Write a protein that binds this ligand. Structure first.
Ligand SMILES: [Zn+2]
Lengths: 597, 150
DNA sequence: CCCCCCCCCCACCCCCCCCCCCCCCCCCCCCCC
DNA sequence: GGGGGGGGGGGGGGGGGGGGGTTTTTGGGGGGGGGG
């Protein structure tokens, strides 16, 4: 007696699918998911009786936002919806459209059933999307086969590049040449359903409608190239790749170099032999049409900031695996904090170098600060394993080097003695001006590098000679060496009272399981976010008398500027908003140790 | 068929252009900056008018400014119609390049001082046909060429 | 430190399409019942 | 006064014609590195 709305080719009723989804999208409780998964005894009513997707839709509607994330296992946890999971996997676009429409209907019905007043016109105007994810096993890109050609799949891989956003027409806009009447036409399966005659019966001219391109409505499309991860490849051949299409607010979900998951329908389409013909090649382009993407506190901060031993505590915590080099550790901690910037340029960078014998802990020290710092890099003074120090013009494009890439982070450079001369010259304007000047291919700019450098350098030959000065042992020239705030020597000279305890400390790491090593990054982050020290007036006189003292003892104003920056860094430590006399005194003292080399 | 929204936009914009009234750092007698700018165009025989978007934004509850932001490509011809009528009223010398028929003058309506600047990465196709301000660095330029207009 | 070397990067059939012609169909007008 | 038939216009379909469809060597400049 009535028509039926059926998912084509399946005999699934769309009313049944709709209500099966509705009765989960409302009245599901998160406790059921722990029944499906392992560790079911961790169910807890005071956290798990929540109407999980009512909670999601409420926060979502208070944010007015269109998208819902949906772990597909939650369908299998709920009795009226376990079949909907199979329909979702096997017939995804229809089921997903049904789920989208159901989310919009839930939003509409909530503001009249839960009946709090809201802009019904806003919800009416808005589109809504489900993002199903964790659909199933992350089957290999190399394992896909033509049975997948309409199923919802899951992939993992590496983003190589993405197009700019591509406008994709959703509604064509037509205008009549004779009578200027206008009509909107939805694009159906990518085809413009052109009106052959003008709509208005009082005009009805044939072939008179014309497309007004910049009055059409466009969705956003983007194409991204995903390479097979080397974890999955067989050893003797190239990795594969798959192009994936991604739309609207999922555009620019990822960038070049991102390792990601995607959940998406595997799709295929024919391609033409030549554009002037309908003739199609007998095997289709394949792509995945994605619906979800994913990559790969203050109380304690203030509590720890009250401590008296904080300087030593934090300094030892940067590398507790390494035997005692404690003034180096203190210097590198102060480098992590850094000074302050000013408008007028003078900036907050602090720069450190380690020299002495090659076969010693300095490399591990650079590695540890690299692991700690938010956005630093590790490199060495010459060559390029597809990563190099200086900015460089190549094909035409400008590439930014490791110094420039380390903007706002510590740049760790090993083999700093063996650095090439053009690089040795280039370091001057980042040391002084924190920038590098580019003047080629019609582009002129001072490309701002804004990086603190931790250098690791070596003597000539196998051993450092401490009876000779640093300039006599090291290759790199004094005017560059002068720019470093703190400069250190680490030596392998035999002493059992050091070597035995080093060996016992080292060997004990294989047996054993205060050291806030994981809280260190959070402390550094909140300090850099919140604290901007200013110099006390008494600290002016302290800086002046200390500088004239070391001047009476070959100093330069670069040492005074260094003492300022170190004192400001010392004031970020302890979360102090104004540089104290003790901050100046420790900056002075540590520099007095360093300048004696 | 006539676009009633476009015609009403033209009416509102034409009125704004001829009688938007303000002055500062001077007497309280209003300058009527865009009528005065039409006089400047008439003196220096120019063919463009610069318009501050915020002056539209304060005018008439900003409804006109919102319309011109959202659907600029639709309403630019209507803005030229309104501008042409205002120029007829206060500087009819300018309706020609100014006998052999000195041709109709075209008018470029150079908006400026928008609420916000979008980056090149912020391009998103709902904004097709809408008014924006964009920033970037000019990496290359074309030869200046004649585009067939009429 | 200076000069020279050497290294790098760069320049004939088939389909789509368009035009022309013929027939058929639909409307309007006139006559007949 | 309404229905049928005849005649003319207008539209659609079918047919026919036509046109289109990368590495390897050589030379030059500039940059980088090594030896006296
Ligand atoms: Zn028409």
């Amino acid at each position: 007696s009535e028509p039926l709305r059926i998912i084509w080719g399946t005999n699934v009723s769309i009313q049944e699918c709709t209500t099966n989804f509705r009765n989960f999208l409302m009245s599901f409780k998160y406790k059921f998911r722990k029944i499906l998964d392992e560790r079911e005894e961790f169910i807890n009513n005071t956290t798990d009786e929540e109407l999980y997707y009512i909670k999601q839709l409420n926060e979502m509607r208070e944010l007015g936002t269109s998208n819902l994330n949906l772990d597909a296992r939650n369908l299998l946890a709920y009795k009226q919806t376990e079949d909907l999971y199979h329909q979702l996997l096997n017939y995804p676009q229809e089921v997903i459209s049904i789920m989208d429409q159901t989310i919009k209907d839930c939003m509409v019905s909530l503001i009249v059933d839960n009946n709090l007043d809201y802009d019904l016109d806003e919800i009416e105007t808005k589109f809504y999307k489900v993002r199903p994810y964790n659909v199933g096993s992350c089957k290999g890109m190399r394992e896909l086969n033509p049975n997948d050609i309409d199923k919802l799949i899951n992939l993992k891989g590496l983003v190589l590049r993405s197009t700019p956003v591509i406008p994709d027409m959703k509604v064509a806009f037509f205008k009549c040449n004779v009578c200027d009447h206008t009509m909107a036409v939805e694009i159906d399966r990518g085809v413009i359903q052109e009106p052959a005659r003008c709509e208005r019966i009082d005009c009805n001219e044939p072939n008179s409608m014309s497309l007004i391109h910049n009055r059409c409505s466009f969705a956003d499309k983007q194409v991204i190239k995903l390479q097979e991860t080397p974890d999955f490849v067989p050893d003797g051949q190239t990795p594969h790749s798959i192009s994936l299409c991604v739309y609207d607010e999922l555009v620019d979900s990822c960038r070049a170099g991102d390792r990601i998951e995607v959940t998406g329908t595997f799709r295929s389409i024919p391609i033409r032999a030549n554009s002037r013909q309908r003739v199609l090649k007998s095997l289709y382009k394949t792509y995945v049409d994605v619906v979800h993407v994913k990559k790969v506190d203050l109380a304690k901060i203030r509590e720890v900031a009250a401590r008296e031993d904080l300087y030593s505590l934090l300094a030892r915590s940067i590398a507790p695996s390494i035997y005692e080099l404690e003034d180096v550790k203190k210097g590198i901690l102060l480098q992590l904090f850094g000074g302050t910037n000013k408008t007028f340029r003078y900036r907050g960078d602090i720069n450190i170098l380690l020299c002495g014998d090659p076969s010693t802990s300095k490399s591990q020290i650079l590695q540890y600060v690299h692991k700690i710092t938010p956005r630093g890099v590790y490199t060495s003074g010459k060559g390029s394993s597809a990563v190099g120090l200086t900015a460089y013009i190549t094909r035409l494009v400008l590439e930014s080097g490791a110094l420039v890439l380390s903007d706002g982070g510590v740049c760790c450079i090993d083999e700093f003695d063996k650095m090439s001369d053009s690089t040795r010259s280039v370091l001057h304007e980042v040391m002084e001006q924190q920038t590098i000047s580019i003047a080629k291919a019609g582009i002129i700019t001072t490309l701002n590098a804004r990086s603190s450098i931790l250098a690791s350098a070596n003597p000539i030959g196998s051993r450092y000679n401490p009876n000779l000065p640093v300039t006599e042992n090291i290759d790199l020239p004094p005017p560059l060496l002068s720019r470093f705030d703190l400069v250190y020597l680490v030596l392998d000279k035999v002493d059992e009272k050091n070597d035995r305890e080093l060996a016992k400390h080292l060997t004990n790491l294989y047996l054993e399981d205060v050291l806030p090593v994981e809280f260190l990054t959070m402390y550094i982050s909140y300090a850099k976010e919140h604290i901007h020290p200013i110099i006390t007036e008494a600290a002016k006189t302290e800086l002046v008398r200390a500088y004239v003292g070391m001047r009476k003892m070959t100093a330069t104003t670069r040492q005074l500027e260094s003492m300022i920056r170190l004192a400001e860094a010392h004031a970020k430590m302890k979360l102090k908003n104004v540089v104290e006399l003790e901050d100046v005194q420790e900056a002075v003292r540590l520099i007095r140790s360093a300048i004696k080399d | 068929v006539d676009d009633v929204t476009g015609e009403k936009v033209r009416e509102a914009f034409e009125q704004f252009l001829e009688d938007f009234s303000v002055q500062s750092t001077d007497t309280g007698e209003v300058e009527k900056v865009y009528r005065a700018q039409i006089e400047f165009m008439k003196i220096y025989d120019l063919n463009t008018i610069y318009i501050d978007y915020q002056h539209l934004s304060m005018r008439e509850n900003g409804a006109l400014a919102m319309a011109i932001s959202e659907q600029y490509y639709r309403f630019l011809p209507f803005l030229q119609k309104g501008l042409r009528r205002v120029v007829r009223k206060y500087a009819p010398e300018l309706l020609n390049t100014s006998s052999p028929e000195q041709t109709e003058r075209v008018f470029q309506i150079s908006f400026f001082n928008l609420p916000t600047v979008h980056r090149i990465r912020d391009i998103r196709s709902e904004k097709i046909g809408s008014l924006l301000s964009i920033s970037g660095t000019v990496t290359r330029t074309s030869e200046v060429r004649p585009e067939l207009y009429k």
